[PDB]
């Protein structure tokens, strides 16, 4: 691993990296980060345990951010998690390893009015294929993902061949669906929302089923 001063200095700078739309950032549990900061003497006013095995943070552990059994609700930046850009995540992973069984918590930088934010809570969609509206599978997406990305995922889940033509629809109310005709639109631009049903239909061996 880098020496403790290099870790501190690199991460101090990386925490302040400008938020640029479309960059990927990573969540780090503030419990783990607090230990890390003590161990590296991150702050001038807390070098009391710098280098001590007692505050060595061990492998990165984000289990406290994740629902028992998906992120916990009402997490607050700084208080519950900190945010690092790709380079900073990758460095921490290299130095400490990621705890066994965990996956990184990768998120995109989207717009927040005229500013930006890391999109922490993804959008869950209910996906199904027209042959059977009861065989529904849920997947999470960014609001910056495209309609094409959703369609690619549905086609994978339901084993739809690349050659079969399709039409995508979103539920608007009971038995009332609207076409998603623009594969380049983002989820934001299409107006999709949490828990919304999306259905794909394939053309028949001959025409459209729907």
Curated annotation (Swiss-Prot):
It comes from the Eukaryota. Expressed in skeletal muscle, kidney, heart, placenta, liver, thymus, lung, and ovary, with little or no expression in other tissues. Residues 2-110 form the DUSP domain. It is found in: Cytoplasm; Nucleus; Mitochondrion. Phosphorylated. Phosphorylation protects against ubiquitination and subsequent degradation by the proteasome. Residues 1-210 are annotated as: Mediates interaction with SART3. Hydrolase that removes conjugated ubiquitin from target proteins and regulates various pathways such as the TGF-beta receptor signaling, NF-kappa-B and RNF41/NRDP1-PRKN pathways. Acts as a key regulator of TGF-beta receptor signaling pathway, but the precise mechanism is still unclear: according to a report, acts by promoting deubiquitination of monoubiquitinated R-SMADs (SMAD1, SMAD2 and/or SMAD3), thereby alleviating inhibition of R-SMADs and promoting activation of TGF-beta target genes. (Microbial infection) Protects APC and human papillomavirus type 16 protein E6 against degradation via the ubiquitin proteasome pathway. A homodimer structure has been reported; however it is unclear whether the protein form a homodimer in vivo. Identified in a complex with the COP9 signalosome complex (CSN). Interacts with SMAD1, SMAD2 and SMAD3; the interaction is direct. Forms a complex with SMURF2 and SMAD7. Interacts with TGFBR1. Interacts with SART3; the interaction is direct. May interact with RNF20 and RNF40. May interact with PRKN. Interacts with INCA1. (Microbial infection) Interacts with human papillomavirus type 16 protein E6. Belongs to the peptidase C19 family. This is Ubiquitin carboxyl-terminal hydrolase 15. The chain holds residues 6 to 222 of 981 of the full protein.
């Amino acid at each position: 691993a880098a020496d403790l001063d290099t870790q501190r200095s690199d991460i101090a700078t990386l925490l302040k990296t400008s938020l640029r739309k479309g960059d990927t950032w990573y969540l780090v549990d503030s419990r783990w980060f607090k230990q890390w900061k003590k161990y590296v003497g991150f702050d001038s006013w807390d070098k009391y345990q710098m280098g001590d095995q007692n505050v060595y943070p061990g492998p990165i552990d984000n289990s406290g951010l994740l629902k028992d059994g998906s992120l916990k609700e009402h997490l607050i930046d700084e208080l519950d998690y900190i945010l690092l850009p790709t380079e900073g995540w990758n460095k921490l992973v290299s130095w400490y390893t990621l705890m066994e069984g965990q996956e990184p918590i990768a998120r995109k930088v989207v717009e927040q009015g005229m500013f930006c934010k890391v999109e922490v809570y993804l959008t869950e969609l209910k996906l199904c294929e027209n042959g059977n509206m009861n065989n529904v599978v849920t997947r999470r997406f960014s609001k910056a993902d495209t309609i094409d990305t959703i369609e690619k995922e549905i086609r994978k889940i339901f084993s739809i061949p690349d050659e079969k033509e399709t039409r995508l629809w979103n539920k608007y109310m009971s038995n009332t669906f609207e076409p998603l005709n623009k594969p380049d639109s983002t989820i934001q631009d299409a107006g999709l929302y949490q828990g919304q049903v999306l259905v794909i239909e394939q053309k028949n061996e001959d025409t459209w089923p729907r």
